[PDB]
Amino acid sequence: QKTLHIYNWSDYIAPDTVANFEKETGIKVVYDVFDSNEVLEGKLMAGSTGFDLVVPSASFLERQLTAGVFQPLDKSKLPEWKNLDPELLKLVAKHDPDNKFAMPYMWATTGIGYNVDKVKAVLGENAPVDSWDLILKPENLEKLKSCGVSFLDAPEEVFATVLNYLGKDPNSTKADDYTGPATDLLLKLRPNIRYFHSSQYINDLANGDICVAIGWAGDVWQASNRAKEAKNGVNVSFSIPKEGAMAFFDVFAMPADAKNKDEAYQFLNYLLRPDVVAHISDHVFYANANKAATPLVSAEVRENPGIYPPADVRAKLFTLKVQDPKIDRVRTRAWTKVKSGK
């Protein structure tokens, strides 16, 4: 009687997905969650994770492959692979050549989640919720402090967002861009930021405890739905700002030392079933990478342009690149200064 150990992002599966898989297959699943690519990457680089499946963002998987931490997926054990969208596979192949190691799961953008009524109360009806100006102009963030501001604890995404806002290459390789203008701006914003955290902002948005967050799209749409279901009067929305935003692709991968590989393939093939992954998207408010599943996704999710954005929005999205030791050094040092004080 076998087990399967899965490590996924929090708030990233439907409530019954695992139970349904267990009932079908007789496999027992141990399911654990993270909210940080850095936490997962540290575990993968430090030794064995004790997991059979993990879910990095593809930009992080790109560098993890060169450490040999994953094993290549045997496509013969993944007959439902045919359901994946060829255009999304090509994009993920920029990180995972020939799609050898990674199964695309969900994708979205890093944008602005906000309480509609509170932001308009503070910055007026014409609050610039369509722009990173809302939170990256110090004068706006000084006012939004009154109702609470969170940033993601995600250094690579935050710096790339700030760099793009400043008109630099989002993946600048100029150290001075990080130590100079990006740091200078973030240090002006810091006094007005309540916390840096990549998951507490969901319930804090939903409950009205913060009014603006840098957030991942589906997380914010979940906060909006939780508030609606609580009938608490809180109106949360999400914006892909006009200056552009980072897109990401989260992907399942199999550690090279996975104990229960056959069971891991069974779960991957299960997630590739159109009705399974559409049901997930319906609950987590993220676009999946399964073309066959799209018609089965609820209209509420499929028709939301902050989840399944149209081509003209997609054209303004950017993706992360791998950096060298120097940039990693200067960026991480700068991030520690920005978060200083807790």
Ligand X SMILES: COCCOC[C@H](C)N
Q: Is 98 marked as a binding-site residue?
A: no
Q: Which among 44-52, 87-95, 125-133, 211-219 is the span making contact with ligand X, rule CB under 6 A?
A: 87-95
The number of residues in the chain equals: 342
Q: Which among 74-82, 152-160, 230-238, 290-298 is the span making contact with Cl ion, rule CB under 5 A?
A: 290-298
Closer to Cl ion by CB, 299 or 315: give it: 299
**Site for ligand X contains 293 (CB under 6 A):** no
Cβ contacts of 173 within 8 Å, gap of 6 or more: 323, 324, 327
**Site for Cl ion contains 299 (CB under 5 A):** yes
Site string for ligand X, 219-248 (x = CB under 6 A): ----------------------------x-
Residue 206 interacts, among Cl ion, ligand X, none and using kind-specific CB cut-offs from 5 to 8 Å, with none
Taking CB under 6 A as the criterion, the residue among 87, 139, 229, 312 binding ligand X is 87
| E-strand stretches of the chain | 3-9, 28-34, 53-54, 103-115, 149-151, 195-196, 212-216, 236-239, 245-252, 287-288, 317-318
Residue 256 interacts, among Cl ion, ligand X, none and using kind-specific CB cut-offs from 5 to 8 Å, with none
Closer to ligand X by CB, 314 or 337: give it: 314
Q: How far apart are the first and last CA of the chain?
A: 46
**Site for ligand X contains 174 (CB under 6 A):** no
Residue 296 interacts, among ligand X, Cl ion, none and using kind-specific CB cut-offs from 5 to 8 Å, with none
Residue 335 to residues 92, 138, 222, Cα–Cα distance (Å):
27, 18, 28
Q: Is 74 marked as a binding-site residue?
A: no
Taking CB under 6 A as the criterion, the residue among 78, 88, 116, 122 binding ligand X is 88
Q: How far is residue 284's CA from residue 281's CA, in Å, rounded to a whole number?
A: 5
Residue 299 interacts, among ligand X, Cl ion, none and using kind-specific CB cut-offs from 5 to 8 Å, with Cl ion
Residue 116 interacts, among Cl ion, ligand X, none and using kind-specific CB cut-offs from 5 to 8 Å, with none
**Site for ligand X contains 93 (CB under 6 A):** no
Q: How far is residue 287's CA from residue 270's CA, in Å, rounded to a whole number?
A: 17
Report the greatest alpha carbon distance in the chain.
60
Q: How far is residue 270's CA from residue 250's CA, in Å, rounded to a whole number?
A: 17
**Site for ligand X contains 313 (CB under 6 A):** no
Contact call for residues 161 and 214 (beta carbons, < 8 A): yes
Q: Which among 70-78, 84-92, 95-103, 160-168 is the span making contact with ligand X, rule CB under 6 A?
A: 84-92
**Site for ligand X contains 98 (CB under 6 A):** no
Q: How far is residue 255's CA from residue 70's CA, in Å, rounded to a whole number?
A: 4
How many C-beta atoms surround the C-beta of residue 27 within 10 A?
Answer: 20
Structure tokens belonging to residue 142: 């000084």
Q: Which residues bind ligand X (CB under 6 A)?
A: 87-88, 91, 247, 314, 317
Q: Which residues bind Cl ion (CB under 5 A)?
A: 298-299
Binding residues for putrescine: 10, 219, 250
